Design a protein around this ligand. Structure first.
Ligand SMILES: [Ca+2]
Ligand SMILES: [Ca+2]
Ligand SMILES: [Ca+2]
Ligand SMILES: [Ca+2]
Ligand SMILES: [Ca+2]
Ligand SMILES: [Ca+2]
Lengths: 179, 184
């Protein structure tokens, strides 16, 4: 049978994953990873979670969130808590990028700046018994091609390899816009 | 500050005529130090020196060198990548990384399109990089085929290259050579 995710639920922000569902989160059709998305505990709260490892954006997990009334408004950032529990992580890095697909902008605008996690610097990261925590914060005020009322349609988060050996489980929680 | 002669915009940019072949600092560049032509790896290259500050602005591009290249009839064509040779000769590089991004400003797409994939250099991995006598050589290759908001004939107007700090202590001289579009 196909991979089966936990129930999808209804798209809501902030996404907190406390109702047993993915609160509208799913794989993008073009995701390089389509493994099971389940709700798992991280740092005392339920979180969206999956496992994967990079060979060898083709190998990159790409999460997707569709919501009809998604607009930037007066928000300046998208933020989320991100946790990693590696089985292997000793070299390279991971780049996290944010994309929206406004129909008025050819179905693609990207937050200009990349959020980078450097696996050679894990012993400097916030951590509890092999669970590493990053407060991912990506500036969306800096997107000039949209206005505050532009219908964004869907948000994608891309987790791309940078010559890493990462393999393990990851967790996403508290996805929200912030001023 | 005195740069070497700007020259005329030529692509591919090989820097063999004693000029910058049209390359300059973007107005928003965080570094505006002398841009000169210097030898790297047996060829002449566009070069500057700088170091990132220890205090990191929350705007992750405020301290980034930003090169800019204006040319008429700047188009992707059937090419899939922008490539260049990038060299670093650090005096300090013990931690962090550098993110290289590529931006064009087509008037038909809001004066801003960006290659989706960042090219990242990890300073913790210098011992694994190609080097000769302290000069590290990276083959920067950035996919532009994946920009869906341009077409092969879209006038791009200008190209900038942003060299952003990722929690690094880099200080030293860098070199850029052989900037071009190329096919997959
Ligand atoms: Ca939660
Ligand atoms: Ca582990
Ligand atoms: Ca040259
Ligand atoms: Ca110091
Ligand atoms: Ca080369
Ligand atoms: Ca040196």
């Amino acid at each position: 049978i196909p991979v089966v995710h936990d129930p999808k639920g209804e798209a809501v922000l902030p996404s907190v994953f406390e109702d047993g569902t993915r609160q509208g989160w799913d794989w993008a059709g073009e995701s390089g990873v389509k493994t099971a998305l389940t709700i798992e505990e991280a740092n005392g709260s339920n979180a969206l979670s999956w496992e994967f490892g990079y060979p060898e954006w083709a190998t990159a997990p790409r999460l997707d969130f569709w919501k009809s009334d998604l607009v930037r408004g007066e928000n300046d950032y998208v933020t989320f808590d991100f946790y990693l529990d590696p089985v292997r992580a000793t070299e390279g890095a991971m780049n996290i990028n944010l994309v929206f697909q406004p129909p008025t902008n050819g179905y693609w605008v990207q937050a200009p700046k990349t959020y980078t996690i450097n696996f050679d610097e894990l012993e400097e990261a916030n951590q509890v018994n092999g669970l590493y925590h990053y407060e991912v914060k990506i500036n969306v005020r800096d997107i000039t091609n949209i206005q505050d009322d532009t219908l964004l349609r869907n948000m994608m988060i891309i987790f791309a390899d940078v010559e890493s050996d990462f393999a393990g489980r990851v967790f996403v929680d508290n996805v929200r816009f912030e001023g």
